Structures are given as structure tokens and as C-alpha cells.
Amino acid sequence: KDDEVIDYIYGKISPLFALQYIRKIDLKHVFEYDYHFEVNGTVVRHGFGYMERFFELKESCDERSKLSKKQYERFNALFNFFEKNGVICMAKDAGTLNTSIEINSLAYHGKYDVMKKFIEEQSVSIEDDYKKAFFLACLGRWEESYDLYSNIILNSIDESNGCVYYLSQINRYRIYQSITQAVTQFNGLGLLTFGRHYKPFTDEFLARIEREMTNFNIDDLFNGMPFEFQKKYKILEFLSDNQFLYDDTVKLFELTNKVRSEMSEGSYSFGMSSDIVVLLRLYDNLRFLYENCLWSVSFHEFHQYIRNSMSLLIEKAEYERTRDIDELGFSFFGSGFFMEYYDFVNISRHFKIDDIKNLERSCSIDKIRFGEQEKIEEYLVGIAEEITKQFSANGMNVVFYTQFISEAKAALYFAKYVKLSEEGLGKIVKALLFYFPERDLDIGKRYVWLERLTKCNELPKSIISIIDDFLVLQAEKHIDQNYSEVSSNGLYSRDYGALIKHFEKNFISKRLSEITLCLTQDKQKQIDFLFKLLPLLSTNAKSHLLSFKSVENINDLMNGIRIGLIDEFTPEHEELIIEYLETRKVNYIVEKEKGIQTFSSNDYMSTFGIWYFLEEINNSKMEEFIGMDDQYDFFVDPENFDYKKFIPSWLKNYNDKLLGKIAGNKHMKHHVIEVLKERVKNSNDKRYLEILMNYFI
Amino acid sequence: KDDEVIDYIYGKISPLFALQYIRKIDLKHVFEYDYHFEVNGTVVRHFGYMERFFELKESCDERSKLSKKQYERFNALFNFFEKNGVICMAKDAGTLNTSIEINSLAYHGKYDVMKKFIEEQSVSIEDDYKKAFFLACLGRWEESYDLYSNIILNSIDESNGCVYYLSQINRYRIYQSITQAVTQFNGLGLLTFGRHYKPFTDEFLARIEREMTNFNIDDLFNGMPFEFQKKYKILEFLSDNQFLYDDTVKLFELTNKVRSEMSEGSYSFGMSSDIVVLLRLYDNLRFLYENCLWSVSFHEFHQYIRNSMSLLIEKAEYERTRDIDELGFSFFGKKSGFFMEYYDFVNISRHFKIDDIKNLERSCSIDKIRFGEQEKIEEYLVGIAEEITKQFSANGMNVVFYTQFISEAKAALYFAKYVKLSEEGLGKIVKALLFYFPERDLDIGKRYVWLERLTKCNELPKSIISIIDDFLVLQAEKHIDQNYSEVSSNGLYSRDYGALIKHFEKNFISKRLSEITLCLTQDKQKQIDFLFKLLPLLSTNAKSHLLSFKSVENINDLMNGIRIGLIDEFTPEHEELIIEYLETRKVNYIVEKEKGIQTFSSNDYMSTFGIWYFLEEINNSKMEEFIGMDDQYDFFVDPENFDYKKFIPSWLKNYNDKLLGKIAGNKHMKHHVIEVLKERVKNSNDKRYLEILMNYFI
Amino acid sequence: VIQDTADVYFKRKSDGKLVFTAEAQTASFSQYILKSEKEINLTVKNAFFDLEWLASERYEVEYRTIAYDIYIQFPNVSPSGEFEMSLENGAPEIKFEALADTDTDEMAVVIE
Amino acid sequence: IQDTADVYFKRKSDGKLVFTAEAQTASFSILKSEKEINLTVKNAFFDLEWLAAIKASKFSERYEVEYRTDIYIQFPNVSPSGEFEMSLENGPEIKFEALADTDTDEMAVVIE
């Protein structure tokens, strides 16, 4: 009977409308291995035509008009639930298929204020408290999360719902692992990182939870449950496993091997390639985990899985972007990859800075086009508003700090490729410069991340004003005679001035003048800092400054050379240069018996050599001593030479002018061409090719 | 008490001498997660319990107070540790070098020794276990299944649970083997083998499907006595459908770590990740092979070993080619790199396919890798060749064993390129490759390619030339029939053994081809054509006698005479044939424009005609009287009209040195070539595009 | 534009009877007195054999596709199926290599 | 040089040891320069005597790192960048970066 088709599908799939999202690849268990649903809809057979008839009813409204009211309701529920998932039709009748991901979860979009408002709202039912517990776990409030999860587990049996019971057990176990590792890391390592001992959860909480969680295996939870639930919800069976997220990793490894082999061979895939499968599986797993309110922030494994999937997709897209073709290939080849809001959020949340740097090394994300930029701007503005609101007051959630600062850093690092508006850029810059913690971003990292944000947004007046206030605050911080900033990059406060001058060459600060015009010889550690920022003030203030302080030290000399104060060199400067280069050797010949290599990071001597090659400094006494460093075989005797001093890295370290002059010499050119051919042949790097194609022939 | 230390280790490890090899990473379960043994020995804590025992090892005075039973326990424990590889503690660790030694006849492929061992009389149950494994390896599957069933039957009576459980697992996996074998033999076996070959009869399958129903791999551990559950927890992971999964995840994590370190350019200290990968691979290999487990039936083990070896080769290539500052040169000046040994050669031969080896050659450079223990590799290759010639010289072949063995034989003969061989071994290998290898696996082109790649380090002595002479005589006799035609998947035909011979023996004639050439007639076609391929291999009198019968009246004969050097200077009425061909091509071309037939054939006559045009040998005006619409002739009729491209981007690598050098000697297309070459070298990674950029173009 | 999903027909030469039908999955092409050096490897998807056919040799392969008729002909092909028994399990893929006879050196044809 | 070194962590106010570990990874990435030095060590035991909300403030200490392998490597200014990641398997990796002040520029020293 044609009216009897929906009895079987309902009798096998009825339990599955108790969830919010199920996986297409996870539908195999509910039908007990009768058909196979591909990751993009289409069903494939694997003794009565069972799934064909139902989809036949969909394309013919006449045939389904003979059903009764109950049958029509069953058909409507099944059709709506299929539409919610993505099951469409059979493969033999498949056509054009485009799949878009849409995750309906407040946690994914980071609506912290909305989550707080929803938590403050009154309770309604058990699922509302399930979502409330998830939102409290996300928001860093962990004790209330644990208590709510325990109460949900307590009352789920009385409310006669088993899925809530099982999922709440799993969530409470995973959050228990979360607090356990949190206190373990806060005790033995937070002393040195945070510079304090911070133990939020008291002894009573841990004492209770360790006793409660003893002999609580993740496995056997499915077996230790009613057999009717065993038959009805087999699809959840794979959740109860210690070695979780393992099949996805194996399938990802196999697909990665297939994609890499196809990249090596240069083959042409047809239809649904392996990368499309990877993307669909990643989106399916993401939607399944997030829409079901499952605690998987506590996993480095999910982060690893998403990282690997996204990196493979980016590498594949780069391969199709840079590849050759043929005439046969054109007869087959004849669909580019571009980044959207969801991909941006995935990369921001699941990647670390090292992973993004590796991606930038291997791939070229500049050539990738970014869409839906309004949503990305909204997301970034929300992140900046959250950080400034939280760090502008006398409060912070340290656990939420550890779970949120990494994502904030990654989002602000990846905002380089996204074009923003004036107000959003101003808010982001203000929150980055005035309220971001100093233990995560030092002055050098702060400057690098600010500078990379001007690649597509330029520098309007508001950003310049914000930088002006930041510089004034730094100047006030330098009032104390026991302050000194340290940078992990070599970029210090004397780089906001250069960045400002690169866009607003004519510019003076109205606030730095007063602190400059209120100085005295005893106000040291402020005159030194203001010497960094000389080109930023008025000429009268400049002269008033350079009165107090002379050039009597080498650091001041190179500073004045750097800020353009000294264009033409002056006498008694080679005096200081020769004094330094003589004291270095005076210490050298006493340490030869001691045997100290002392390869310091100081770059004064190589800079002196570079100055020598430009003939600005030229004198016989310069080569009187020669120090330990090997770099004087360049600018003191290009004929003596050695294996190498540090040339192989310095061709990429140097600038255009010095490389061009290098091409204009006598004998070392052939050695340079030999080493460059060796590097380009036995390596893969664009820089060694650019200096081989542009400055050398 | 110091004498009481060994009571606990014996009381927790006593069962584990019932096996032949255990994994160091699998020792965690026997001690119930007390310490952790690193993959290369050393133990780390996680009452000093093995600390005292390892203290007794370095002080013979302290262990002299033990009784006879205690001394026996200590000797057994020390010998078993020495057999495994557990050495000492990490805090007392020192110089550690690990060498793999698998003691298995199956691994080394001693088929004759395995047959002799099977024919020998039985002794005990373990001997029949090894016998069943050897029969499964040797392609005799029915007797293997029967022996496994009998072992399972009598294991309970012999009271050895480990044999019972392992025999259950082996029988299940071999049951999967026969099931998939018959499934693949029925469908797609009709087209490949050109026959329907069904070795196992209906009775066998009817029995085994009934016996194997409701036999899950899982739950086997639980359905056994709890004493076995406590004693042999280390085997618990064998009973799992999703087997070899944790190793895959660990390999993926280590691969990610290694790739990240390659990208950053970091300097790992001590035991790096690649060392962990190598040691884990060796440990798993030894565990599976030494315990006589049926894992030939898995593509997953092959995938695991393939991935491990490929990662190791890529890492070794990186450290060989990496850019080094002062620090790396100081810390690794002597370059204690990675080199290939006999075990690695056997692993690559057995577990890799030809496509995987080609991908390895594309990505890496195995020529720069040094190969050691070449005597064992020569012995292995000689054994493979002897087995293939013995099997295919008589009227017999085990087709199942053929399917399990021919792939490894092909891979071994393909990878023998990098190994230096002796004269007798090379002669045996060449004879077995040319006279007895099946034609359905290696056609004439693949045969020639694999023979040619074997002369990279062995040159070509006289015996190999004689063997090739007999092969050519056999081919000539095969061409007697007027319904024979050889097909090659590479474009290399029988007229390439002659060129290979002449490259090493420029002065050489064949004493056997003359008689078949001097016994020809005008009606003996399909042999004159073949002998025209091989003309430079005969005597001058035979050459003239052969050219008496056949003229140059066809284009194929023309290009053949050009190829074998018969015609050095061109002759009249040759441009006649060229003009006729290129006129008929256009005559068919303008009738198909309305029909719209694109007709890219694989024929390369017209591009070759253009190449001949640029050397002024064929210079005329009637050649440009027509165009076949082919893009390739815009090079040699009008270098100024041009297009996007004809096929230049692949033809810079397809051409030879002379034509590229002449390309550098022209007027206008040089700048277009330099633009496309800069684009290719910038937005790609290929050595060839760099060589044409560094050598012929500036 | 090409649909990027063609249909492959495998038939027997010397007779013409259709052997089986399949869906294209992968196509790989590798490359004075010049010479040719190129190979064509084809991999197809789940295929069912002809009912009449189930109850040396030469074979032909035809690829059918449309760009919005586009035809690809391989006159001489050789199957290269390999036996690989695997874990779990219970249609597999079939691999072809393009051949070339020595008289007419043609291994691939395209019709628009 | 020996492939295994030893790492000592000290405080820049009393020269008091903080912890001792074994090195695992070292990454090294008018004129100017811009370079970074990241060090990653393995399982470390903290000093037995040193063991006895968040505001955006830099009222922290300064630390030194010594590599022993005689070969001596000195990092006078270091900053530990501890990252928080909870794992599935439950049952110590330490990272730090080399710093440099703006007037006594020095990021790495080697003594032979």
C-alpha cells in the first residue's frame, strides 16, 4: 500500500525529533544499514523499495493527497525534519547541489551580553536550564554551571527524558575534567605566568566533586541504561567513548592523503572531490556539536581537527590557484574558494598565532577574497567592546580570560584581510591600545598588530588621535625613574611616531609639548624617552629638548641618526665609533684564553660596516683593530672573506639599495651567485628567487 | 627486603613469556599504569619498584644473595627485558642506538624454506600455528583454514588460551580474506584475468559462511575467563573492528608536529618526533610479524607503513636540503643523516605501490640517499627472480598467491634501481624479468622502462646483451604470424632494446636474426615491418637484402628510416608525402567544421614536421599553403602570429637542449617565453622550470 | 560550462558489445627525430556489468559529457585492477591505462 | 656538541632558581632588526623553596634562562607565554620568548 510507506520510516526514526541536529553520516545507524546518505544529501541503496517511495511522494502532490490526517501529519513532520537536516533525494535523481552552513547558537557568535540577559531571565523548562548551564560554562562561571548540571541530572529521571539525562551526564563529566585541569594548571604554573597564586574554586568544591566523580567511566554509560533507549538512540552511542573524535581523525587523514596524492600527480577529479567531502564533514560536525549544546571548548582535539581541516582546505585552494593546465586538461577542466563569515570565525577561534603564521608561510591568504564583511566587522566590534568593557573596570573572570584572550588575539590578528569602517576601526584600535592586557601583548606585539591593521584601512584622523593619547599616557608612565619597557620584537615606543609620520608627515602633538616644556636636568628617564619622539613636537619644544641633552653617548648618536636629526655626519663621531671598536678588541684578547664566543644580539658593528660601504665614514684607523664578528669581511676586506659571515640570511635581511650596490662590485658577485643558485635549487623560498630575478642576473 | 623486589614483577608479568614479542608501549597495561616506558627503553615515574630491580643489574654483589628460585626469576626477567629492549631509567640513560631484527621466515620471503618446513612432520600446537601462517602466506588458503579450525578445536584441550584467542582472530581474518577474494574474482575478475577462475568450491564457502555467522571481532575478550582478562590485558586491543586506529591518530599528530617544525625551521633536541615515528613503526612491524598474525589481508597496515616511510623520507630530504645558519652547522656539522638499509628496502618494496614510489620520487630525491647492506638486498632480489622464474617456467601458478606476490615483485624490481648488483645476480634478474614475467602486468613499454632503469649503476655487460638478443629473437619469431601486434602503454616498443644495446655496444651484430631475415619473401609481411624496426642490429648484407624487399613508400617507414639513422640527408618526393598528408588533414578538416569535431589525436607528426622546419631541412612555401588549425605549428610557420599558447609550457620540459638553445636565439617570442617562465617559477615549485631559466635563458 | 560529471562506457573491441557503464572519477595525464612519452590513467566509480556480458582481448572507452556534445574516445585501453583485501567492508573503483598500437600512434581522441 | 642540554630558570631580583628542565625546541626567527627567539622545554620540577580577577598591569618580575651543554647559552630577559588548553586524556610543556630592553640591547649570549 502506498499509504503504508511512512509507517516504517516513522517506526524507525520517531525518537530522533528529541534533538536539535543530527549528522547525515550518523543516519546509518537509525535505519540499521539499509541505505547510505552522502554528505551532500543524495541517498544510495546498499527487499522492498523503501526510501524511494517517500521521495516519490514529494515530487507528486497528487499521490500524497490520499493520506489521512495522521498520515499527512507524519509526512509533514518527516519532510520538515529532512529539510532541517539536508536530506534531499536519491543520487540517480540528483542535480545541482549547493550547501550552506547555518549554525543557530548564541555561543558560536559570541553574544556575551545576550547570553547574560538570557541567564538572568526566568527558567521555563529542563531544556532551557540545559542551555543555561551551557551558557554559564561558556561565560566562565563554572561553579554555577556544575551545580545546574547536577540539578538537571537529578531531575531528568523525574521528568522522564533520557536524552537530557545522558547528555547532562556527559557534560558534567567534561566540565569536571575542565575544573580539574584548570586548578592543576593554576596551581603549579600560574605563579610564574600570572605573577600570583589564584585559586577561585575553594577546597569544599573540589572535595565534593572528586568524591562524586570517582568510578565514573565515560564508557559503559550506554550499556548501563534501558534497552529501549539502547535501541532508540543508537546514534548517540558513539558519544560515550574515551577515545572520542577518533573516526573523524582517521577519515581526515585518509582524505588528506588522497588530496596530497592528487596534488602531487596533478590529476583532475570529477564531481564531489575529496576537499568538498572534508568541508562538508567539518561543517556537519561543527553544527552537530554546537547546536546540541555540548561542552567541547574543553578539548584541544576538536581544535586540532578544525585546524587540520581548514589548513588542508586553504592549501588545496592555493594549489588550484597556482597550477598549470594542458589541452586535454582544458577539454576536461574548461569554482574558486573564498572566505566567508563562518570560516573567519572558525579560523579565529580554533587557530593559534603559530598556526596562522604557518598558514601565511605556506599559502597566500592575500589572494583569497573575503565576503560578508559586514558580519565580520560586527564580530570584531563585539570582541573589542567586550574586551574594553571588561578591562575598563575593576573586574575580570580569570577562567573566562584564559578561554577568551586567545580567541580575541587571533581575531585581531586575522582582521588584517578584512576591510572595516571608520567607527569600527576606531573602536577596535582604542580597545587594543588602551585596555588589552600587557602580559599578552607587549609594546612590540601591540605595534605589529596595529600596523598590520592599516594594510586596507589606511589611517584616518581618529586613529591618529588615539595613538596620540596612547603616547601621552606612555610619556606619563615614563615620569617614574624606575620604568623600562621590554619588547620581544625590537620595536619600541619610537614606532608609533614613525607610523604616524608615514601617513601624516606634517604633524605636531599639542599635549606632549607641555610635558616637554616642563622638564629639568634632574627629570631623567623622561628626557631619554622624549628623545625617541623628537619629530613629533613643535620646533621650539624640539630645541628646548635638545638643549638639555647632548649626543654624548652612542645610543643618542644612533637615535639622532634614526629620527633624521643628523643628516650630515659630524666630527668626534668616529671618535666614539673607534672607542667602541677598540674597547671591544681590548676585551677580546683577554677572553681568547677564556674562550667566550659572545655572539650577542647587538647589531652595532654590522651597521658600522654598512655605514663604511656608503663612504659616509671612511678612515684608516677603522680597520686598526677588527673585532670577533665575521661581518667585517664584507665592509673591511671583501677579498679576504670566509665560508660565510651571515650573508645567506642577510640578503633577505638587507634592503634594496645595499643589494643593488652588492650587484655593483668586483669579485664576491660570483660567490653570491653560486650560493644563490644553491639556495634556489635545493630549497623552496620566494625571497631567494626575487633577489635572483631583480638585483642579480 | 631487597630479595622481595622480584616477587611483584613476576607476579604481574608472569603471563607475558607466553608470547614471542611484546610492545614497549604495550607494557603500560601489564603494570596497571604505574610507570611509563618510552619507546626507546628508559622508564619514567608517573616506593621505587623497578628502580631497585634495575639497580640489581649494575651490581652483581647485591644480586648474589638471592636464592636459586630468585636467581632463576631474575635471569628470566633480565633475558626477557633484553629480548624486548627495556634497558634502564631515563635519569640514568645514556647513548642509545636501536636496531630492528625481525626473526620471521615470512618477512624475508623464504618460500622454499617455508615449503620445506610445511612438508616436515608436526611437533606441537605452536608449530601448527606457524604452519597455518606459512600456508596462508604461500597462497594455499583452504588448508590454512582447515589447520586454523583444528587448532581452535584442540587449543581448549591443550589448555593454552592465548593460542585459542589468536587462532580465532586469525581464522576470522582469513575468512574475510577468502570472502573478499571470491567477491573480487567473480566481478571485474572476468575482465582482468580474461577468464572466470574460482578456486574455492561451493562446499567450502557454504561451510564457512554458516560457521562464521554471528562471529563479532568485539566481545571476544569479554567472553573468556576473568583470569585471562586479568593476565592478558595487553592483547585486549586486538579484539576490535576499528583496529590499527590509535597508531593512525598518533602518526597524524607526529606528522603535524614534524610538518610544523619543517615550516618554522626549528631545532628539536634529543629524541625528535621522526625518531619516535621510526621506532613505533619498527615496534609495530616486529610485534605483528613475529607473532604470526594475518595482516597481509589489510590495506590499513600497508597504509600505515606507507605513511610512516613517506614521512621519514620527506623529513630526511628536509634535513639534507634545509637552509642552515651558524647554529645548525655547529650542532650538526658531521651530518649524521638518514640512510637506507635492508629492512627499509623490504618495507618499501612490500608496502608501496608504483604510484606511491613515483610520488616519493617526485617530492624527494632518493638518489642522494645512501643504501647499505647491499649484499642482503641482492640476495632478496635474486630470491624474488628465482621464485618468479620457477613459478612461470612450468605449467603452474597459484593465482591467489600470484595476486598477493606480483605487486611486491613489481615494486622490488622497480626499486632495485638504486642498488648496485653483481654480474650473476643482474643476469638472473634480467632473464627472469624478460622471459617469464607475465605480459598482463608488464607490457613491452613497462618492461623496457624497468630494464633501462636497472642500468643506472650496473651498466650493461655481455651476458645481459645476450639475454636481450634471445628476447629479440623470440619476439621476431612471435611476429611470424600475420595477426600479431604489440601495444605499449608508454609509447616505447620493441625498437628500443636495439637502441639500448647500441648505446653500450655501438659495434654489434646479431648472429640469429640474420637467418630469419635471410629467409624472407614478398609474402612474409608483418615480419619485414618488424625487422625494419631492428635494422641497425643486423649485418650489412642482411641490411641490403632487407631493404630490397621494402621501400620507403609510406610515412611510417619514412620516420623509421629517419629514426634508425638509415636516412641522414633528406631525399626528393619526401616533402611530397608530407604535403599529401598535410593536405588530406585539411581536406578532412574543413568538412568537419560544420560537424564540429575537435579531434585532438595523440599523433605527433605535425609538431615534428614543424621542428624539422626550424632546422631548415624542410624549407618550402607549400607547407604554409595550408594549416591544420593545430596550435603547435604557429611556432614553425609564423612565430609572430602566435596565440595564448600552443603547448609551450609543457614543451619546454618536453623539448631537448638543442631546440631550446635555438629558441633562445630568436627575435620576439623570447620575451613572451621569459614572462611565462617567470610566472611558472614564481607561482609553482618545479626544478625543471628552474633549469630552463638558469641554463638556456638569462 | 562542462558539468564536471561525465559518463563512461566500457565496451569490447573486436565485437562491440557493451561491457559496463560507470561515472568518471579521476583522469590523469602524464608527459630532430622527436618521440612521444605520455600516459593516460582513468579511474571510475561504482559500476555494474552488463547482464548479457556476464554469461588476449581489446576494449574501448567512451566519455560522454555536455558543456552548457562533448565526446572522449580511448580506442585501446587496459584494465589494471588490483586485489586489496581490507578491514570491515561487506562498489569499488576500476583503473584503466590508455594503450597505443604501433601502426597508428593514437591513444586519445576528443570530439566537440 | 651533545644533543641534550639543561635549562635553568632564575629570577632577576635575587638570582634564585625557579625551576630546572631539559630543552626540547629552540626557534630563531639607519639600520634596524626584528628577530624572535622562542624556547620550549620539557617536564620541569619547580624549586622546593620558590613555591612558598586580572588587571591590565605590568607589575611583573624579570627572569633569566641558562642553557648548559663547556657550552653556555644565556638569555638575560625572558617572558613565559603559558597557553591554557584542556585535553581529553587528562593525564608539562613550558614556552618562553626572549625579550630585550631599549638601551642595553642583548637577546642571546654564547660562551664557549
Residue numbers in the entry:
A (entry chain C): 304 to 349, 353 to 640, 643 to 1005
B (entry chain B): 304 to 349, 354 to 1005
C (entry chain A): 4 to 34, 51 to 74, 168 to 180, 190 to 211, 215 to 236
D (entry chain D): 5 to 33, 52 to 74, 161 to 177, 190 to 211, 216 to 236
Give the published text.
The defense-associated sirtuin 2 (DSR2) effector, a SIR2 domain-containing protein, protects bacteria from phage infection by depleting NAD+, while an anti-DSR2 protein (DSR anti-defense 1, DSAD1) is employed by some phages to evade this host defense. The NADase activity of DSR2 is unleashed by recognizing the phage tail tube protein (TTP). DSR2 is arranged as a dimer of dimers, which is facilitated by the tetramerization of SIR2 domains. DSR2 has a two-domain architecture, with the CTD responsible for sensing the infection signal and SIR2 acting to prevent phage propagation.
